[PDB]
Amino acid sequence: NLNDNYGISRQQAFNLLRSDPRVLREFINQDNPIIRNRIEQLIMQCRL
Amino acid sequence: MDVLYSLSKTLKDARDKIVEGTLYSNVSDLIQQFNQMIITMNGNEFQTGGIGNLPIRNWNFDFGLLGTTLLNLDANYVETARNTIDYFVDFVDNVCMDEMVRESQRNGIAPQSDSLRKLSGIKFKRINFDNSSEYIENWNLQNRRQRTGFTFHKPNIFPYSASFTLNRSQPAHDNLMGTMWLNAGSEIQVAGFDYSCAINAPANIQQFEHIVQLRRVLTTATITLLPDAERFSFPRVINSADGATTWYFNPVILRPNNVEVEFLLNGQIINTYQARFGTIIARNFDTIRLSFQLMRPPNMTPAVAALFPNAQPFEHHATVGLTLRIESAVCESVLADASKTMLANVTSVRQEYAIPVGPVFPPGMNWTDLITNYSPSREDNLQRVFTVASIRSMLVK
Amino acid sequence: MDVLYSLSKTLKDARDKIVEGTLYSNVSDLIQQFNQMIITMNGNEFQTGGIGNLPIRNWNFDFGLLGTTLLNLDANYVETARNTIDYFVDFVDNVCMDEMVRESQRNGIAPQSDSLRKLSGIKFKRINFDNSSEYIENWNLQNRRQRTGFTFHKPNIFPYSASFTLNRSQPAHDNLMGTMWLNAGSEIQVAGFDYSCAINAPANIQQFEHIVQLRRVLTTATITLLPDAERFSFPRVINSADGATTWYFNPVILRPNNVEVEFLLNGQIINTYQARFGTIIARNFDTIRLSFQLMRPPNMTPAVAALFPNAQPFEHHATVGLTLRIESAVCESVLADASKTMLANVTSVRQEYAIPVGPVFPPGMNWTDLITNYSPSREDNLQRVFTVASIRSMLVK
Amino acid sequence: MDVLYSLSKTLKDARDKIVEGTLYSNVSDLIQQFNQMIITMNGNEFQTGGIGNLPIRNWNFDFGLLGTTLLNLDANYVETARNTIDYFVDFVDNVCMDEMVRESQRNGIAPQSDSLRKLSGIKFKRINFDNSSEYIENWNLQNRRQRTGFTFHKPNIFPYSASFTLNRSQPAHDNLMGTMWLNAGSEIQVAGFDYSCAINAPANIQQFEHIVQLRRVLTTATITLLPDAERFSFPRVINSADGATTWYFNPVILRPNNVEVEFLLNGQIINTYQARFGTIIARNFDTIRLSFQLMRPPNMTPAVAALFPNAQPFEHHATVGLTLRIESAVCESVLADASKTMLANVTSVRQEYAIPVGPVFPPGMNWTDLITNYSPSREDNLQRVFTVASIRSMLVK
Amino acid sequence: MDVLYSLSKTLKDARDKIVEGTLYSNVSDLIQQFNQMIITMNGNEFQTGGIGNLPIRNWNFDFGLLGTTLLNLDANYVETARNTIDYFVDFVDNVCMDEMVRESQRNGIAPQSDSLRKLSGIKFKRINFDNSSEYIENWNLQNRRQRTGFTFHKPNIFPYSASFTLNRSQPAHDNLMGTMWLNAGSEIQVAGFDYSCAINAPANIQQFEHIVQLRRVLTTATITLLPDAERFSFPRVINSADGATTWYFNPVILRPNNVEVEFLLNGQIINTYQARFGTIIARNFDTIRLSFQLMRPPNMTPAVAALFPNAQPFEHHATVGLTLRIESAVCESVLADASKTMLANVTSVRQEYAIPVGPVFPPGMNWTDLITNYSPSREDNLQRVFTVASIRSMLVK
């Protein structure tokens, strides 16, 4: 979904694959809903 | 762009008209046009692509003309003509896929995908055959500015909003008054709900108003206005504004009386309809004002009287609804519909070739955020990509 | 009228085909037609309007032909072409409005808007170019009487009717049986209700029949038939026939068993579908007959046995519904649709120019009261104005 | 078949263009075409029918050509043109009515109705004028195998399936969990329902998934996704799996959370959309996986806590819905829509001429059981009959 | 395809006839044909491979003709002939190995492996020498549609099915009545077993029937029918239906009385055979019905009377068998046999070059799942690959 809608560079793609906190938080500060939704779902799954 | 449409149209008409056995008296003009296109193209080198996962292609046209000597076309001629046409078709598809992706905040009408800038030259203007289609006609008109218009069936002009509004609320949410609405695509389903059924109200009547403000003016809209909105007519468990708590909503439908639909323009009223339902017309409107009421039945049977008492519990909430669907319409600007695949082609190309996000279109071209802010730059770029999409779809479907 | 269509068509094809750079081989014929149009028009003076806000515009035609020595086209030729075509375009738009805003019970097909009576002369007959479109093809067919047809998508053949019929009633409205229906545009939704859930009936089966009659025949209709209608399936407060009191309707949906859809023609059965749902067909039909049943569930769980007791209170009323939408169709007569704009353009012109109401059309051309009594006079006038409106829309959308 | 479409097109263009007063400059080509058709035809004797109530007809063409010396067309010319055109028109109508009823499992594309095989012979190839229509164009493409496409507005690709699935059930049917779905035409309405509002499930969340599998791939689908399914949102009485007993269903709608719609293809994924509503797109897909949840509200008001207790009675069952409509789409394979009449024409002809059930098509050509197994043989025969139906409809609608 | 067969046949006849010492009187025509082939080929460039582990080999033909100047062939002639023929043979073999692996649902009769689409042109039609083989003859027949036929020896038409059916069951499996069957390749072995030897049945007789419905129609079948089916004539331990438990089966074989074998065709009866065993015939049949009985011997000796008591224990279960093999047959479609290696060549090619699984053939081309649904698409693809496999076997076995 991200690569399609929010067209993604090679470095960003490689680092998202490697689960890199730097680019993850760059997106979360860029206010990317495709990622913020996933993270809010991780919260709603990490509740208990 | 006109030359792009002309290429596409004469290639379409060549794949259609030029078939074995046909009569040269029917395709002489199209053959002269095709040969002129070939001449104008011979000697140029085009480049296509360079954005996202779209490859970089090079085109070099050196073909041979089509013979004007025959009287009845044979297969040895059709085969060569089709070998010539498939290359042009791939070139045009690639140009359109190069042009649907790019954007600009400065002169979006001015072409991108520099092969198309090259085609905009004055040595390529000899290719024009006819510009009859709706999008290209409106393109040429809006350039030679005139009163234009696109025709739409079930247009998507309302951005998705499913929301409510409470004019009397409590923390317990046991005696409410308010209005709910779903504005989506071509439909507006609105429902004014009062939990007391207008017992404490004056004259046993409670009003509701819903104002929709379109971003672009429409014209000659055919609309279907029915009562008893459906998706606000069953039990529900809805969250508060602040998300703290929730509340129950058990509706019971009543008719809206003294109903009124005003189609307005720049605050002035244009059309007005009173107690009419079914099919209606709107000659021009930028704003819709629905106004309806909830009238407590002066007479009541035992059951409904035991449903509408004079105390606060109010376990059956009176409602009054209205569905309004725009079926057809006409607009000076370009939108999406439920008939045409232009937006779909554009979005599919961008999603396929992983186009980075640009300055003009929203990420992924989501029609909600694209029609909630329809600024002239977005409008121009959207018209351009929709036009080249129509072009590409005249050839590859 | 044919001449008017020819004017509109050659003017559209002129604005389209006559562009910068195109090749004279492609437009030689259209230019001969345009020059002939000019030759035949020049020397005639026309008057248009005089009803409502329509100004009384006088048209004089003094134009010169289009040159033919050229091989390709230049801006110095397209400019004159445009300066000559815009005048014919506005003249045609004004004539089309003057013909949309006039009526007649005697010879409604015959041309009103006397400029058009002039165009129907024998000297103007030299302008007929191609009667291609659907409306004008059917016009000429009906003149030369033949099996005609208009193809429609979601047509508005049903007038808005929301009503009920109670075959067992009491003043307290406590044990009722009957059928409610909403017939609007292209959809029907009919729901048979029984408050006793068929406990006192024979064999625990109650019948329900809805007989719809259409004021015009249809053919090759494609239909979608689904169960469990949605707008007669939630709690409701309905009014008496005499409008004095009200009653309550708390439904619980069941399935129609032994459902039967009979599309008839003058009482002669044509199509009969038994327990088929989804997409179905009707080759020719004037009347629809929907016959379904409410069958009490003989094997019941506690949760549902608690709802269908053997005594009168009956706080859950068994309901059985059918939705029937007509998606496409073909009709010998003209109607309104969800795809086309003819009705919208007609009513928009009339509302914009404040035309008084005539002896034929109702006030504001409310489609419900227009299709209720669809007399042949109204049919002829509606065909005429729809044809000239399509003509007008082919130039000014 | 290409020569049949050629016949129909030149006959339509004759009936339209050849009208009193017109200019030979515009019909010279069409007249040379008509006369070549007459020459190709004259001497050939055809037969038509021999199945069902189709009367057996024999055609013998011996006509005279049309003048070419005139300047303006007169009545004594159009009259002969019409006396010649009516014959070919009824001939083509009878041919298409003979070719829409015949079937075969081996080489359905190959023409049946041996008169049409004769036309497919090599001496009749000289009649081809232009294969412009979408259907005949895609036919020529599939012959000269290439990337095809048919564009559809609201296509009927889902067969009627109104069914549920229970993942936790009992004989009493008082604490259930599962998912209901109605898939019909172009719409899917799905609804996951739990009676206990996820009080015992982990994390107060209950998951639901619905996998729809299409029998043919689609492309560029414009889709409308909304929450709060309608026809699974009111009280209901539903039968058991084995048809023995019935159970009650009193739903209460909540919001879908963590909604995700995935458009897949051959098990591989193409598109996905998470919490996006309204207008979305699917560029290529053969499967749709909807996935939603039911999340018990942690905070709750008195009224809703009265409906969601912690014990088994559970007289109000929590639900979560999803409506999904396919407004437009593209497909390499022929289907039915809400815009085109071809299926209606075929089924009407068969119903009218009493065609017994064949080996390929089911009885009555019920689209449900014809798309539940869209075998390539059925696809070929269906494309064939739809093409000749389009052809016939171009003359007799 | 015909040209491919012609290539293969002339190369076979060349490797055979063209040998040292042979006489030009015998190979004049073959030399003319080979030279014509070389001429038709010289100038063309082919590509073969690119699916799975098939290498992508490019073929370029520039060869020299074969003289016609001698009477007896010398080694200096045969050497050139062989150095050309080996190249042509490797080319044809690679083409066939690229054509045996490409599938399609749409037009499976049409050449895949686009080098063969090239060979199917009209500049290559000059190669045809004689289409003598059975497969290629039936191919030309199905193109020029006519009544075909393939002759078969021991045709594998039955999918492997070992299964029983208990018309009287118990949880302990101590008194059973039913029938067992194994259908495999060309043979059926059926056995009706009763544990009580029909003591309690009317007339001391029990009936048994077995209906096999073939997927394709056979003609002129020669059949061998014998009693005492072997593989159900010794002790066994067989599972239950749901697979939970097991039950013993101790057969004691008896003879079928009133044996009746009916070869039917679309429910109608064609051949009936009563009390006959051994060589029999069946002129046309799509279905076989074997109806036999088990008759309690009334006059029993001690040793056998001690086996069939009048109570439930029943440690010896009476059986009645029937074996039926289809030795030879004729079928309008293509199947597999015990005599021809076409299927083996195809499946071996695929297993060798690691061909993925396509939309048509099941994984590994298991004849069971390939015959159990003999779809027309599968029939066409199977006939095509079988024909080219025969072609490749005429060169390399």
Swiss-Prot record, chains B, C, D, E:
Q: Which residues bind Zn(2+)?
A: 153
- The ranges of region (Interaction with the inner capsid protein VP2) come to 62-73
What superkingdom heads the lineage?
Viruses
One GO cellular component term: viral envelope
What does UniProt say on post-translational modification here?
The N-terminus is blocked. Sumoylated with SUMO1 and SUMO2. Sumoylation of viral proteins seems to have a positive role on viral replication.
Report residues binding Ca(2+).
266, 286
Q: Where in the cell is it found?
A: Virion
Write out the GO biological process terms. Answer: fusion of virus membrane with host plasma membrane
The alphabetical list of record keywords is:
Calcium, Capsid protein, Intermediate capsid protein, Metal-binding, Ubl conjugation, Virion, Zinc
Q: Name one Pfam family in it.
A: Rota_Capsid_VP6
Alphabetized GO MF terms: host cell surface receptor binding; metal ion binding; structural molecule activity
Q: How does it assemble?
A: Homotrimer. Interacts with the inner capsid protein VP2. Interacts with the outer capsid glycoprotein VP7. Interacts with the outer capsid protein VP5*.
The free-text function statement in the UniProt record for this protein reads: Intermediate capsid protein that self assembles to form an icosahedral capsid with a T=13 symmetry, which consists of 230 trimers of VP6, with channels at each of its five-fold vertices. This capsid constitutes the middle concentric layer of the viral mature particle. The innermost VP2 capsid and the intermediate VP6 capsid remain intact following cell entry to protect the dsRNA from degradation and to prevent unfavorable antiviral responses in the host cell during all the replication cycle of the virus.
Under the heading HAMAP family, the entry gives: Rota_VP6, Rota_VP6_A
Put simply, this protein is called: Intermediate capsid protein VP6
